Design a binder for this molecule. Structure first.
Ligand SMILES: O=S(=O)(NCCNC/C=C/c1ccc(Br)cc1)c1cccc2cnccc12
Ligand code: NI
Length: 329
């Protein structure tokens, strides 16, 4: 069908309502509103020669795995045996050709002025520039931003239960490893549903939401397969990824590489356990809860999560943890 213009994705009224909501080396995320509902639009420059935010642009061959992975995981919400809504919904994906829209520069500048940006102002693109535009269902606010905003340790327990279940269903269905599930990639949004549902290998179960619905995002480093065909990001030659410091996060890259002996095509669902450990660590060390752990029931949930932190690395997959760990019984 050949690339489409930016107007195909952002008709004039959608485009007028865009406000920037996040960024990364990858590019830019804008929020717009259709039918009274927000959506998140990730715009990623590809195939061009310009350094963009200090890195070279991905080729189509290079951006395809994130595209494939985002579709697969979204489609889990419509499956039967292995079903979950725990990954971000993908409304659409297009390949767009043109220079960056002036109205998006406007929103970008407003962000820079109010929040600050690490990014180059994206105003240097020519009319042949290619982009991948991923429209996601709006997932809420990342766990790092919600650091100080979780009600209780029951909230933290629901979040870890949701994440474990999501990863398990994806493991069973797609032999999925997220491989970069830092706390910027766990989004939280209010839900009025008391219980959330997933189905794992045909068995349906429920999770108390504690008023939040968790969505997993960012598949830039992820791996999965369908019918024996593997899709992944080969970081075996990447130096930088495994020489970070200052946070347990950066240990996880090193620990994954130890587990997989630097063979990123292979399937090692222990990587999901590593990430869930990192996340459990954040829950217990870097969250300021809005309420106090001042009841016997809340004290017990705290001990359970501390037990989880101390034992979870002795399980083989998110599936194993979810099926066998005492925390979820
Ligand atoms: O606007 S976003 O980029 N919000 C998620 C990331 N928020 C910034 C966190 C960055 C970050 C990066 C690394 C670490 Br470690 C911690 C935080 C964003 C990206 C993709 C899909 C989205 C769906 N709904 C809402 C937002 C969506
Ligand atoms: Ni279209």
């Amino acid at each position: 069908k050949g690339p489409v213009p930016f107007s195909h994705c952002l008709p004039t009224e959608k485009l007028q309502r865009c406000e920037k909501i996040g960024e990364g080396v990858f590019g830019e995320v804008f929020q717009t509103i259709a039918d009274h509902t927000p959506v998140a639009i990730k715009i990623i420059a590809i195939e061009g020669p310009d350094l963009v935010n200090g890195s070279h642009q991905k080729t189509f061959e290079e951006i395809l795995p994130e595209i494939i992975i985002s579709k697969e995981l979204s489609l889990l919400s419509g499956e039967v045996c292995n079903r979950t809504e725990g990954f971000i919904g993908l409304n659409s994906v297009h390949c767009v050709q043109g220079s960056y829209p002036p109205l998006l520069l406007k929103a970008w500048d407003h962000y820079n002025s109010t929040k600050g940006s690490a990014n180059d102002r994206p105003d240097f693109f020519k009319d042949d520039q290619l982009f991948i535009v991923l429209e996601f269902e709006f997932g809420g606010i990342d766990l790092e931003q919600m650091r100080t905003k979780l009600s209780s340790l029951a909230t933290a327990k629901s979040i870890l239960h949701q994440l474990t279940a999501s990863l398990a269903v994806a493991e069973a269905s797609l032999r999925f490893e997220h491989r970069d599930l830092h706390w910027g990639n766990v989004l939280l949004k209010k839900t009025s549903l008391k219980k959330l549902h997933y189905t794992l290998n045909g068995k349906s179960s429920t999770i108390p939401s504690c008023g939040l619905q968790v969505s997993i995002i960012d598949y830039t480093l992820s791996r999965l397969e369908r019918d024996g065909i593997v899709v992944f990001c080969d970081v075996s030659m990447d130096e930088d990824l495994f020489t970070g410091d200052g946070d347990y996060q950066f240990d996880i890259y090193r620990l994954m590489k130890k587990e997989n002996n630097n063979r990123w095509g292979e399937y090692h669902p222990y990587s999901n356990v590593l990430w869930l450990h990192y996340l459990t660590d954040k829950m217990l060390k870097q969250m300021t809860f809005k309420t106090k752990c001042n009841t016997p029931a809340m004290k017990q949930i705290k001990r359970k999560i501390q037990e989880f932190h101390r034992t979870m690395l002795n399980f083989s997959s998110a599936t194993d943890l979810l099926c066998q760990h005492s925390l979820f019984k």
